[PDB]
Write a protein that binds this ligand. Structure first.
Ligand code: IY6
Ligand code: MG
Ligand code: ZN
Length: 312
């Protein structure tokens, strides 16, 4: 059969948590197929259907600075690296579902937060009152799965099919950072009082939600230059949202106000202490081989500290 293979530097570095998928857009599909084949098998999906699904997914990501096709493939690579470092902890269905979930998790993102859609009074905010974009992203995922020739799950039973779509739904809802805080507190408490039980489906669900937050944030776990240049894309979106808030007559919060450019180093520190470090710490407690994500995060935190001390 037809194995996908990568040039040697990519074949070695793609196994590491800090791998950057590179600026060559045309290689990103092959990089994803490579990762499905190794984390799932050459048997998981019909090659033709999978290729047709990947290209329709790509086409439904928009040309925004951050929440774009490159982000989708980046989040999927982090998941690949978690799965490959925790071989025997996951079901066959989870292996199938989570890479697809990660590829799909920001489908048809417009570069605006749930908060901005609610203030603009966008139709999606009446259709979905919480996790607005995330319920959209899962809805776009089902759309694409139902196009002709796009059912990559066509070999599962009705109940295996329903279970995979349920893993994907919860994984995508979990990328709503508003939900992350409470999910990580519960996991922290369950880990610390020894109640954490991976045979309990509601426990697995929480663990997969935390993996989703971890993959979604993995830009803070790259080499410093990748971390820093990504943060420019992230802010380019947030600042355009801030401009849109000012057009609605609403002073945006400082994170979104390009006039507060200077405070970015300190906003990144708060973010690493409040979200990132706690995320990768609890993840490392539950899945010890994901520790390189925590260690990279802590290295980037110390790089933002140097930026504030004027040494960078
Ligand atoms: C991968 C990645 N993911 C996220 C998510 C976010 C957030 F969720 F906070 F929006 C942030 C922004 C963090 C931030 N900046 C600021 N301001 C900057 C100047 C004034 C205050 N406040 N805060 C909390 N960065 N970020 C990155 C780099
Ligand atoms: Mg999202
Ligand atoms: Zn995302």
């Amino acid at each position: 059969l037809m194995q996908f293979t990568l040039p040697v530097r990519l074949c070695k570095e793609i196994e590491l948590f800090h791998f950057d998928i590179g600026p060559f857009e045309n290689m990103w599909p092959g990089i994803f197929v490579y990762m499905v084949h190794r984390s799932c098998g050459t048997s998981c999906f019909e090659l033709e259907k999978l290729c047709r699904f990947i290209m329709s997914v790509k086409k439904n990501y928009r040309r925004v600075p951050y929440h774009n096709w490159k982000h989708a493939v980046t989040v999927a690579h982090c998941m690949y690296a978690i799965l490959q470092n925790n071989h025997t902890l996951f079901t066959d269905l989870e292996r199938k579902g989570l890479l697809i979930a990660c590829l799909c998790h920001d489908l048809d993102h417009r570069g605006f937060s749930n908060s901005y859609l609610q203030k603009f009074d966008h139709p999606l905010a009446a259709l979905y009152s919480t996790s607005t974009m995330e319920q959209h992203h899962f809805s776009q995922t089902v759309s694409i799965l139902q196009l002709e020739g796009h059912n990559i799950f066509s070999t599962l039973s009705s109940s295996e099919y329903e279970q995979v779509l349920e893993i994907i739904r919860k994984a995508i809802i979990a990328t709503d950072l508003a939900l992350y805080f409470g999910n990580r507190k519960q996991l922290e408490e369950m880990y610390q009082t020894g109640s954490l039980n991976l045979n309990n489906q509601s426990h697995r669900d929480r663990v997969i939600g935390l993996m989703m937050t971890a993959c979604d944030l993995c830009s803070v776990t790259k080499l410093w230059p990748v971390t820093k240049l990504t943060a420019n894309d992230i802010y380019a979106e947030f600042w355009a949202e801030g401009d849109e808030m000012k057009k609605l007559g609403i002073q945006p919060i400082p994170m979104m106000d390009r006039d507060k450019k200077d405070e970015v180093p300190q906003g990144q520190l708060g973010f690493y202490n409040a979200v990132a470090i706690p995320c990768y710490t609890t993840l490392t407690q539950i899945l010890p081989p994901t520790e390189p994500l925590l260690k990279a995060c802590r290295d980037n935190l110390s790089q933002w500290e140097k930026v504030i001390r004027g040494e960078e």
